[PDB]
Amino acid sequence: LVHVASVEKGRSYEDFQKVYNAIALKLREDDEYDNYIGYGPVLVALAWHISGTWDKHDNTGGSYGGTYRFKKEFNDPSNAGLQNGFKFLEPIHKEFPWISSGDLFSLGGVTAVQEMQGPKIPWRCGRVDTPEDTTPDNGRLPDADKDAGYVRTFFQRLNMNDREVVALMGAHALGKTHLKNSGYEGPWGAANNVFTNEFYLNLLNEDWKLEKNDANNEQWDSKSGYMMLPTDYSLIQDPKYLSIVKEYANDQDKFFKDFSKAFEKLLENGITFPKDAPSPFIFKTLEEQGL
Ligand code: HEM
Numbered sequence: 001l002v003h004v005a006s007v008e009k010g011r012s013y014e015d016f017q018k019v020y021n022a023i024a025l026k027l028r029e030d031d032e033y034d035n036y037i038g039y040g041p042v043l044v045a046l047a048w049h050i051s052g053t054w055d056k057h058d059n060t061g062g063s064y065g066g067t068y069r070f071k072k073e074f075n076d077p078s079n080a081g082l083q084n085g086f087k088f089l090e091p092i093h094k095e096f097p098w099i100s101s102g103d104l105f106s107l108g109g110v111t112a113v114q115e116m117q118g119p120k121i122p123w124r125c126g127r128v129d130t131p132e133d134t135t136p137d138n139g140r141l142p143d144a145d146k147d148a149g150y151v152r153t154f155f156q157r158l159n160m161n162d163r164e165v166v167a168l169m170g171a172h173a174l175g176k177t178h179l180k181n182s183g184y185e186g187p188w189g190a191a192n193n194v195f196t197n198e199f200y201l202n203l204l205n206e207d208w209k210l211e212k213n214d215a216n217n218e219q220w221d222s223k224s225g226y227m228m229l230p231t232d233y234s235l236i237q238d239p240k241y242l243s244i245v246k247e248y249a250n251d252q253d254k255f256f257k258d259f260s261k262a263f264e265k266l267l268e269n270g271i272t273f274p275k276d277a278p279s280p281f282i283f284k285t286l287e288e289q290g291l
Contacts, residue, residue, distance in 0.1 A: 019092065019096050039085065041175025047109025049082060051266050055157055056269070063268075066101030066128075066129040066130065076141070080180075106267045111283070146234075152165065158266065160265075169235060173197070188202060197248050197255045205249075
């Protein structure tokens with residue numbers, strides 16, 4: 001099963017920058033969402049879950065098909081809450097009906113990271129909508145109540161290694177858990193709509209206490225009012241993971257570089273880019289444009 005990137009007919013860089021700008025302007029505008037966190041975090045969670053269904057063994061799932069738009073996938077329990085990012089992006093698809101669904105979903109994650117002051121994330125167009133019967137079954141995304149062995153195995157399905165797994169998990173500096181969505185409740189840090197190395201710092205520097213939440217699930221809670229999932233806490237339980245956690249706590253630029261490569265790879269898993277496709281695009285922020 002091969003998925004070959006196909007550029008939207010006649011579109012170039014400047015066209016996609018417009019779609020970026022529209023997402024970015026709307027991010028600016030809808031600042032009240034989720035108690036003033038804004039929609040940045042749910043947008044990067046949506047781009048991760050639509051890519052996270054990939055299976056490297058048979059190339060099923062992945063971001064290419066746009067299959068999150070079908071009821072079997074948006075009804076995935078693992079995706080509870082992400083209907084809000086989809087709803088956000090609907091006016092944008094309306095304004096730019098020529099972009100594919102996979103391209104829009106994935107571009108929404110890139111746009112969110114950069115406007116929340118994270119690193120630049122190169123992005124490539126050419127995902128093509130596939131039909132309903134290519135929608136992967138539920139159950140392909142990761143459980144939160146497991147340990148580092150589980151996490152390591154899980155991410156190997158996505159062809160991610162130790163550094164990649166730890167870099168990628170740093171996105172949990174953003175947003176928060178919601179009891180009615182996941183059975184977990186609370187934020188990971190204080191600046192949860194700015195992209196920083198705070199997750200790593202909080203992991204190492206906080207006083208964590210293991211507790212049961214109101215949904216009867218175990219989670220780690222700090223005196224500062226922060227939390228960590230069991231899978232998050234894994235990263236300082238495994239010695240290999242802990243080494244890298246310290247690295248990123250100590251050096252945000254290194255974390256930024258590694259996240260950037262890892263997020264692009266995650267969003268492009270399963271896609272074949274022809275030799276003569278366009279080079280990855282690096283979009284300007286609104287700020288960089290005076291907008
Ligand atoms: C072992 C892997 C991980 C587990 C078990 C997992 C689990 C969770 C859980 C349960 C939530 C809260 C959902 C809610 O209640 O609304 C959460 C949210 C979040 N996750 Fe993860 N996650 C994983 C990895 C990742 C990765 C790789 C990324 C992206 C690069 C990511 C991005 C985020 C973000 C940004 C949110 C916050 C969204 C918002 O506030 O609504 N997660 N995750």
